[PDB]
Write an enzyme that holds these catalytic residues in place. Structure first.
Site, PDB file in Angstrom:
ATOM      1  N   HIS A  62       6.758   1.145   6.423  1.00  0.00           N
ATOM      2  CA  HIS A  62       6.629   2.269   5.509  1.00  0.00           C
ATOM      3  C   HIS A  62       6.034   3.518   6.202  1.00  0.00           C
ATOM      4  O   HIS A  62       6.128   4.594   5.616  1.00  0.00           O
ATOM      5  CB  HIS A  62       5.663   1.857   4.341  1.00  0.00           C
ATOM      6  CG  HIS A  62       5.995   0.529   3.813  1.00  0.00           C
ATOM      7  ND1 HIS A  62       5.125  -0.525   3.774  1.00  0.00           N
ATOM      8  CD2 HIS A  62       7.119   0.168   3.126  1.00  0.00           C
ATOM      9  CE1 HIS A  62       5.833  -1.574   3.131  1.00  0.00           C
ATOM     10  NE2 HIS A  62       6.982  -1.149   2.811  1.00  0.00           N
ATOM     11  N   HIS A  92      -2.106   7.060   8.871  1.00  0.00           N
ATOM     12  CA  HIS A  92      -0.638   6.956   8.817  1.00  0.00           C
ATOM     13  C   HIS A  92      -0.150   8.346   8.419  1.00  0.00           C
ATOM     14  O   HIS A  92      -0.881   9.304   8.186  1.00  0.00           O
ATOM     15  CB  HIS A  92      -0.174   5.852   7.860  1.00  0.00           C
ATOM     16  CG  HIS A  92      -0.616   6.092   6.457  1.00  0.00           C
ATOM     17  ND1 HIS A  92      -1.753   5.510   5.931  1.00  0.00           N
ATOM     18  CD2 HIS A  92      -0.057   6.875   5.486  1.00  0.00           C
ATOM     19  CE1 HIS A  92      -1.891   5.980   4.631  1.00  0.00           C
ATOM     20  NE2 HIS A  92      -0.889   6.841   4.390  1.00  0.00           N
ATOM     21  N   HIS A  94       3.212  10.663   6.412  1.00  0.00           N
ATOM     22  CA  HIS A  94       4.393  10.743   5.496  1.00  0.00           C
ATOM     23  C   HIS A  94       5.232  11.976   5.888  1.00  0.00           C
ATOM     24  O   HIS A  94       4.651  13.023   6.231  1.00  0.00           O
ATOM     25  CB  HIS A  94       3.916  10.959   4.075  1.00  0.00           C
ATOM     26  CG  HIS A  94       3.041   9.867   3.558  1.00  0.00           C
ATOM     27  ND1 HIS A  94       3.548   8.701   3.014  1.00  0.00           N
ATOM     28  CD2 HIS A  94       1.686   9.778   3.551  1.00  0.00           C
ATOM     29  CE1 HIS A  94       2.498   7.912   2.641  1.00  0.00           C
ATOM     30  NE2 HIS A  94       1.338   8.543   2.987  1.00  0.00           N
ATOM     31  N   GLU A 104       3.183  15.126   0.718  1.00  0.00           N
ATOM     32  CA  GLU A 104       2.909  14.454  -0.621  1.00  0.00           C
ATOM     33  C   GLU A 104       2.269  15.385  -1.558  1.00  0.00           C
ATOM     34  O   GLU A 104       2.777  15.636  -2.693  1.00  0.00           O
ATOM     35  CB  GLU A 104       2.089  13.174  -0.391  1.00  0.00           C
ATOM     36  CG  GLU A 104       3.019  12.169   0.350  1.00  0.00           C
ATOM     37  CD  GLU A 104       2.710  10.676   0.097  1.00  0.00           C
ATOM     38  OE1 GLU A 104       1.503  10.399  -0.044  1.00  0.00           O
ATOM     39  OE2 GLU A 104       3.618   9.867   0.010  1.00  0.00           O
ATOM     40  N   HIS A 117      -2.576  10.923   6.472  1.00  0.00           N
ATOM     41  CA  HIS A 117      -3.637  10.309   5.646  1.00  0.00           C
ATOM     42  C   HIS A 117      -4.577   9.528   6.535  1.00  0.00           C
ATOM     43  O   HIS A 117      -4.186   8.685   7.362  1.00  0.00           O
ATOM     44  CB  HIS A 117      -3.036   9.415   4.564  1.00  0.00           C
ATOM     45  CG  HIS A 117      -2.325  10.234   3.506  1.00  0.00           C
ATOM     46  ND1 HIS A 117      -1.399   9.675   2.641  1.00  0.00           N
ATOM     47  CD2 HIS A 117      -2.432  11.564   3.216  1.00  0.00           C
ATOM     48  CE1 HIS A 117      -0.930  10.652   1.826  1.00  0.00           C
ATOM     49  NE2 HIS A 117      -1.563  11.817   2.156  1.00  0.00           N
ATOM     50  N   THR A 197      -0.926   6.228  -2.505  1.00  0.00           N
ATOM     51  CA  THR A 197       0.443   6.817  -2.771  1.00  0.00           C
ATOM     52  C   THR A 197       1.568   5.832  -2.481  1.00  0.00           C
ATOM     53  O   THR A 197       2.752   6.247  -2.530  1.00  0.00           O
ATOM     54  CB  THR A 197       0.640   8.187  -2.160  1.00  0.00           C
ATOM     55  OG1 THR A 197       0.829   8.016  -0.718  1.00  0.00           O
ATOM     56  CG2 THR A 197      -0.587   9.105  -2.413  1.00  0.00           C
ATOM     57  N   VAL A 198       1.199   4.570  -2.165  1.00  0.00           N
ATOM     58  CA  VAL A 198       2.148   3.509  -2.047  1.00  0.00           C
ATOM     59  C   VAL A 198       1.705   2.387  -2.911  1.00  0.00           C
ATOM     60  O   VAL A 198       0.496   2.243  -3.177  1.00  0.00           O
ATOM     61  CB  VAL A 198       2.281   2.961  -0.624  1.00  0.00           C
ATOM     62  CG1 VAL A 198       2.948   4.034   0.272  1.00  0.00           C
ATOM     63  CG2 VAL A 198       0.938   2.586  -0.013  1.00  0.00           C
TER      64      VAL A 198
HETATM   65 ZN   LIG Z   1      -0.579   7.801   2.630  1.00  0.00          ZN
END
Ligand SMILES: [Zn+2]
Ligand SMILES: NS(=O)(=O)c1c(F)c(F)c(SCCO)c(F)c1N[C@H]1CCc2ccccc21
Ligand SMILES: [O-][Cl+3]([O-])([O-])[O-]
Ligand SMILES: [Zn+2]
Lengths: 259, 258
Positions: A62, A92, A94, A104, A117, A197-198
């Site tokens: 992810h 991580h 996005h 995000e 993040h 957010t996951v």
């Molecule tokens: Zn995140």
């Protein structure tokens, strides 16, 4: 489960197995700066990071995940909206399938190309990251926007590893990482109560979203889209996009660290 | 040569370095009701690599831990600073008695000692020497020491002191986790000032942390066992090496916090 960001398993479908997706404290959000209030009660932010705390980088399917030795208070986030000491655990990123959007959080309608993040957990109260992720005061996450700009040399240690972690589940040793220098010079931020957010989308995060973006070049960003969301021996699919859209505020207010 | 004894000590330094009586001299009295909170000040951004420390020596005026400042492994950013300031050197000031050894004094409170962490602007200058003569050239982090629990990181320094008793003696010293030595809070005061030893150059952006770190009395006392004299000279001990507070002369002292 097999949630992800493809057509059948992506964000709009997560509520089928994680109904907290439509909850009242979900992230990310839209920040309307005309309705944010400066809060003078926020304390200075304190970021004490030790490059030796980083251990490994992996492809979780992810994103990439940089994991940090967290049994130790060598890398901690304190101050700002936080009570106590929050231990660094994960970094991580996005992104979207093209450069024009992919962050995000969205501030007065502006997207950025990507968003980092930096996940921390309250080790003053809870025994583990896993536990802390189930408590309202358990997690603190820094959000850093990445704008298309001239290439950023602080992304090289990450980008140099991506071929070694192309398939889901691959990992590699990753230490001596200068995370501090990946942050922008100004740490002015917005803060609000929200969520992972996951999936599992837990409402356990105090968000600290920095106003100032860092740069990334398109050629650097494109390398992240060459990661797979599939494991070795599974039919290949690319992680070209891995960002959740903003969710409604539902009555929450966003506070600013700066006038 | 200059020192901290009767005939060569602070009150006589002006006789050889007239900037001793300048308008931006350090250290100072920090009077908290007079300090201005400044919301534009940033939190400190601190990166110190424990491998950067290389050598500890007795200068005759303090110990000095010299860091390899070949490139930007160890830097200070943020705070009041524009750009990146590279770690060069650490040293300590103390007095003959534990309740009066710091250089900066806060509302009359002296601390037992004061650590100085010296950095130079490599974004504007090519070397420490060039930076040390310019008003934006140096940034120095001052950290108070109070008597309390032995400090295991300072024990590593105290263990070397017998080997550097004489002025000019050096010994290898590395794996020093300076970042972990700092106190829990990095809230600070800041003002423009100077080196607190000759040549007393007015090139220092001072960043004085409010919260002290502890040292035991016995650890502190070992620093007074250094000599201000070299091998073959009549022995005299460095029992005190702090300069008195200097006139503020209308500078603004600012706070990162309120
Ligand atoms: Zn995140
Ligand atoms: N690179 S160094 O060992 O020379 C040095 C440092 F590393 C420093 F950190 C400092 S700060 C003052 C406290 O020790 C120096 F002054 C000096 N001394 C320099 C600073 C400029 C100057 C002028 C006249 C005599 C000596 C000096
Ligand atoms: O408080 Cl002052 O000593 O500078 O007048
Ligand atoms: Zn000094």
């Amino acid at each position: 489960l097999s949630w992800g960001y493809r057509e059948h398993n992506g964000p709009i479908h997560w509520k089928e197995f994680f109904p907290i997706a439509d909850g009242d404290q979900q992230s990310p959000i839209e920040i309307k700066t005309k309705e944010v209030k400066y809060d003078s009660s926020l304390r200075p932010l304190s970021i004490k990071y030790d490059p030796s705390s980083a251990k490994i980088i992996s492809n979780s399917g992810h994103s990439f995940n940089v994991d940090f030795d967290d049994t130790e208070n060598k890398s901690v986030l304190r101050g700002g909206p936080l009570t106590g000491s929050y231990r660094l655990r994960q970094v991580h990123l996005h992104w979207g399938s093209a450069d024009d959007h992919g962050s995000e959080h969205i501030v007065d309608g502006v997207s950025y190309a990507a968003e980092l993040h930096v996940v921390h957990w309250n080790s003053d109260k809870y025994p583990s990251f896993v536990e802390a992720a189930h408590e309202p005061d358990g997690l603190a996450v820094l959000g850093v926007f990445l704008q298309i700009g001239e290439p950023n040399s602080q992304l090289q240690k990450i980008t140099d590893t991506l071929d070694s972690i192309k398939e889901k589940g691959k990992q590699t040793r990753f230490t001596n990482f200068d995370l501090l220098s990946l942050l922008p010079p100004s740490w002015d931020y917005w803060t609000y109560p929200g969520s992972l957010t996951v999936p599992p989308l837990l409402e356990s995060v105090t968000w600290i979203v920095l106003k100032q973006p860092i740069n990334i070049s398109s050629q650097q960003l494109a390398k992240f889209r060459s990661l797979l969301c599939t494991a070795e021996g599974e039919a290949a699919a690319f992680l070209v996009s891995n960002h959740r859209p903003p969710q409604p505020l539902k009555g929450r207010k966003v506070r600013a660290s700066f006038h």
